[PDB]
Amino acid sequence: ILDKIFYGVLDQGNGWLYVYETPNQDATYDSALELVGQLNKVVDQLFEKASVLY
């Protein structure tokens, strides 16, 4: 499960193995993290411009 080579989770509350083979991670949502990431960096730099006004 640590390799992630078939995914799944192991339940010792009854003794089953659930085998989940469903897709992971939304690609679209994930690339939105790097885009926000870059906007959060830029605004510190815009604030360097605004030191001119002060």
Binding site: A32, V36, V43, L46, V52, L53
Partner: protein, 50 residues
């Protein structure tokens, strides 16, 4: 809706930079404005002479 949120916010970044830029343009134009007043003193008298 979440992509739309990031985008509205991206457009806000861009605009707050355009807000600071024009504000610098005004800070610059201030110097020119000061200098102009002392200068216009000299010009008034000459044009009346002619």
């Amino acid at each position: 809706i979440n992509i739309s949120n990031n985008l509205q916010k991206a457009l806000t970044v861009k605009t707050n930079d355009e807000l600071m830029v024009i504000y610098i343009s005004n800070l610059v134009r201030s110097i020119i404005a000061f200098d102009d007043l002392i200068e216009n003193k000299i010009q008034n008298k000459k044009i009346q002479e002619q």
